[PDB]
Symmetry: none
């Protein structure tokens, strides 16, 4: 069952990003805090939509896609990925990682249903690395 | 109005990009027409120093984020 | 001391590069840390005209030789 | 059966040569147009008599003879020339090429009778090359500078014209045009080309880059 | 059999380009008119040599080469190109498109002999797109 | 009259050649006597600088076109 | 057995590079002299460390690596390289060329033991080409005119120097030198070259002709 | 086995040519000294590249070619040339004399391998005569 | 004395050649040394106009008769 | 048997050449007169030595050699020359025409012995044409 993040925590994090900036160690610590439980693509996408401005959000979408592509290359380079399965029918496509696959587009409940925990942690680590890249790039 | 936005002589580039993306996304354009418009407004607005900086890009920039990153890297510190 | 080397207002760039590479290679740094230090010293020393010339490089320069070649190509003849 | 060229087309071509000159690309295009069907020696000779003045006509007769002699040397160097035959009795003499052979002198009908199509096309190509030589001869790239007030497209036009209409080999025009763009083209554009983050390896690319990043004034 | 374009039409088109410029809609209409029948590389090359100045002609040679290279990439990406054939022996090289192949250099008759109609229409469309690019670039 | 044509002190050589060939071909001479007359008029008219230029020709010039080409090549640019 | 180069010769070469520069023909001749016997990677590396400054040495390391990579591409494109062998077990890796392979790092004796003579000559030619590139890079022909008072041999020396020490391809230097002799070289020599009864098709022949028939003054 | 000439001797000879000139009897004696052992085309070519300036080097290349052509004419006029052999398969082409033949271009070791001693002495005498001609011509 | 013979400023070339050949053949030189001496005296005497005329000879003149013929052909009529 | 020309006629002809010049029609008529009987190379050579100055004599030697070479080319182009014979053993070399062959050098008697009448008339016509050339060239 999907539970959304508190809008109070999200508002506090947005104001933190607004006053301290993207690169302060306190901001990265707060992001790591709100990046503790494995989030669904819907959660991370809306979180970055709210806390980041338009141009940093575009940059972050780009960087997140690139990092997820590196993850999928490593996944096709190793059939023992915690997102993959043993047979070929469990291979994870980027539509399933970005939340674009069938039964997931716009629906967080179905998303949480079909996604694997390894998928969730890989998406989360990818999003964190992308946030780091964009923060280092913006300023 | 997005089509009336110019980068001022003294304005920085991140402020101009913020203002332009705000006015383009908060307008009556379809969602699939915002990125090309933002790019082509970066290229034709954004006073001729940055215009030439974007023009002479050895790589092809196909996203507002990539253009912003490139310009922030190679901008004239002043 | 390598970290105290600045490009003088009247000094050419090849002399500055020679002096800097000499002081960095004849120092106590490990061999695997000389190239990144030379690059980051080219970027932060080397008075702001060449600083902006290196900053606005459409290509990514990942070697002191490549940076030297680029700067020698596009330098302000004077 | 021999059909003469229209005197209207010949008059228009003569006036074209009179106003534009011998070396203009429009004039060479018009000559290529009137050089489309394989012409008999009579046709080309009268055509050059009408369109060219006396001295260019003398020069053209010389050059045409030289080129035809080169053709006949290649023909004696290969018995499979489309003008030649297999046996030795079909070897083509210069009297047959210049229209001086027996049964051809002054008579275009007999000319068209005895001549081969390979003979006609060889004569035609020879005459075209001779016209090119004389045009290049009748009317300096290393002295061309971009004036202080001149635009860059005019300078590029003038330079490319003078370099392509010169005595350089065809494989040496592009490097010369590039290196003349770099050393001529007054120091603002010189520095603009020097500080090119990309490597420009063609005159067209240099022209495009300069037109993009030029100082609007 | 190869028939050359009228020098009268070419002279009128050259004067049109001289007075109206490269980008006027009347000039593009006239070029489309003289670009009606599929032209051999010799025809288009001489046409652009006559109507364009030296620097626009250099730019146009560059652009034509680039567009022909894109065409050849699409051709190696699809063996059913109207310029290609079914077997590998009919694959079309850029020497055959630019008129540089064997039996074609400087000879328009042999050119018209060996070239395909699909080759001709592809060359013609490429030249038209290159003219459009150069016209948009010159002014 | 062809036999009265001289190259003026300030006239170029192509104008003189044009005038002379015109007057010789539009005259009462037989067709087989025009080329030798044009050559011998190039040699004796065409003021003494070009006269000496034609005289000291290491090759033998046997055609008006060849003489014109030679003189145009080796003429004193002024 | 490995024998080091004399430090006396190396000191003389270093002072030559210090006074004359990297691009002088005497310096390139001296380098060719000390590049006569096939050197081991250790020898060439230490030689360039001593004769070149820090920044030219970095540039030279880069260029040497690039040229060696081109050599290894040609080697994988032809199994008959004098550095390669017939079987796949003799294929030469860049660690063996740069002296980084096993049993070679820092030891010139072991280096000389395992290396092939073809390997040595390929390394040496690569290092020479890299030195040429860096020398051309570390320090304009179309702007050279013969001064009103300058002699012709000085002008020819200056022009040939600037043309050969430039970015032109090797196959484009002679035509450019000729066409610059013809258009530069103030109008007395211009007319002297123009009125040449023979056709001059080489800079040496043009120089000889002009030196013969020049106006003694 | 090929052994290069000492760069010390070459430097001394170059400075001799620089101070005394090309035509002094001491310079010709020094050249005769360094022309004692039969040199390979590589050796003489590099020697003249180093000791002569650019324009004298061009003149010397011309003169050397002419003298070698005279030698090859005498060789085809007499099958008993010390460079030739008895059969027709040993006839010496100018590519073999100028070092342009197969297996010789740029490689002095292979050069020394395939060349004959008569070839070497003929090349050497030709180069000496060419040097004399150029020296008489330069001043 | 042959080595003291100069072509006067107003003297023609055939008179100078006659005088020089006379003095050289009626002297104490060996018979095999007269032609080279006559040639080298034509080249160094024979005032600088004819000197330059002989110098700029596209062909190589290897006989006094050939030099005389060439000079008589290309001489400055005056 | 060889009979020399009268020194009185030769003196009169020399004074004619001295007063009237080389090109006067009276001088050419006198030369044709003294060129009536076929002369041996010795006779014509001494005649031109006496009547011509040194420089015209050099020019005449050159021109005579050239004309004799043209004659010998025509002779090798036709085996029916009145100087030639039918077999190859009668082919006439320039040493026999210029009087340089064996048994002729300096001896007019032996000259008259071995020479053919066709040889004599060819030599005479060649000398006359050479005299005409030199006379046209001298003034």
């Amino acid at each position: 069952a999907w539970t959304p993040l508190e809008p109070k925590l999200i508002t506090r994090l947005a104001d933190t990003v607004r006053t301290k900036g993207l690169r302060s160690p306190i901001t990265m610590a707060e992001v790591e805090a709100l990046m503790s439980s494995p989030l669904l693509p819907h959660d991370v996408t809306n979180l970055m939509r709210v806390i980041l401005g338009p141009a940093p959000y575009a940059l972050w979408m780009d960087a997140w896609g690139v990092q997820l592509q590196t993850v999928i290359a490593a996944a096709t380079r190793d059939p023992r990925h915690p997102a993959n399965g043993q047979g070929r029918g469990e291979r994870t496509n980027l539509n399933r990682l970005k939340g674009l696959a069938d039964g997931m587009v716009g629906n967080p409940q179905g998303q949480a249903a079909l996604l694997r925990p390894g998928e969730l942690v890989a998406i989360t680590a990818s999003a964190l690395q992308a946030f780091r890249e964009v923060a280092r790039l913006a300023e």
